[PDB]
Amino acid sequence: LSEGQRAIYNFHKKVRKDVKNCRIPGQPPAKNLTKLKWNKLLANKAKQQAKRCKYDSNDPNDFIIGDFESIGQNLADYPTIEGAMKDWLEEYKNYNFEKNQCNGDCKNYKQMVWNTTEEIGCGYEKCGKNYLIVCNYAPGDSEDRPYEAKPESKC
Ligand SMILES: *[C@@H]1O[C@H](CO)[C@@H](O)[C@H](O)[C@H]1NC(C)=O
């Protein structure tokens, strides 16, 4: 993994560890989340997409990757990788787990804490001032809640 790739991978590991341990503010802790494994095919497809330097593109070809049945995707148009990661994460401020409802945009946060997601790979390209960052996830998420809650005492 590149420098950026490794940082994006660890930031996702850390978010998922945090949500299991009451460390995402105002969000119930998660009972279980599959461990993410990096996947080279997701990462390369992410990278071919990000090299176009088009944020909206999307393009259902970008969602057909090897044999995966379902692919989710988070996109960021941002001057730094860490800023992008933090922007996706803090969408947790908009998300109500009990009602499964969102005020504004929750899609990036929900995909990061999606309990059945197993494979991740991410790709980014410098496109002028900013990066286009593409993360692909397998399986992708749905409109449901991201995980099963567990009692905050188990933290
Ligand atoms: C993920 O969450 C769903 C409920 O939203 C739960 O029924 C399912 O068993 C969970 N699966 C895993 C692998 O954690």
Numbering used by the authors: 4 to 158
What is written in the article reporting this PDB entry?
Vaccine candidates have been identified, including Schistosoma mansoni venom allergen-like proteins (SmVALs) from the SCP/TAPS (sperm-coating protein/Tpx/antigen 5/pathogenesis related-1/Sc7) superfamily. SmVALs are characterized by a single CAP domain otherwise referred to as SCP/TAPS, NCBI domain cd00168 or Pfam PF00188, which is found in diverse unrelated proteins from bacteria, plants, animals and viruses. SmVAL4 is secreted at stages linked to invasion, which makes it a viable choice as a vaccine candidate. The expression of SmVAL4 by yeast cells lacking endogenous CAP function restores the block in sterol export. These studies suggest an evolutionarily conserved lipid-binding function for CAP or SCP/TAPS proteins, including SmVAL4 and yeast Pry1.
The structure of the first SCP/TAPS protein from a schistosome has been refined to 2.16 Å resolution. The refined model has one monomer of SmVAL4 in the asymmetric unit. The recombinant protein is N-glycosylated and is a monomer in solution, unlike some other reported CAP or SCP/TAPS proteins such as NaASP2, GAPR-1, VesV5 and GLIPR-1, which were shown to form dimers. SmVAL4 retains the characteristic α/β sandwich CAP structure and a large central cavity. SmVAL4 has unique loop regions, including a C-terminal extended loop with a terminal helix. Only the CAP4 motif is present in SmVAL4 and the CAP cavity of SmVAL4 lacks all but one of the signature CAP cavity tetrad amino-acid residues. The absence of these histidines makes SmVAL4 incapable of coordinating Zn2+ and implies different underlying mechanisms for the function of SmVAL4, independent of these residues; indeed, these residues were shown to be unnecessary for sterol transport in yeast CAP proteins. A similar cavity was observed between the corresponding α-helices 1 and 4 in the SmVAL4 structure. While the residues are not conserved across the representative CAPs, there is sufficient space between the equivalent helices to facilitate palmitate binding. These analyses reveal that SmVAL4 is structurally able to accommodate lipids such as palmitate, and it is possible that palmitate binding in SmVAL4 is akin to what was observed for tablysin-15. While we show that SmVAL4 is capable of binding lipids, the electron-density maps do not show any evidence of any bound lipid.
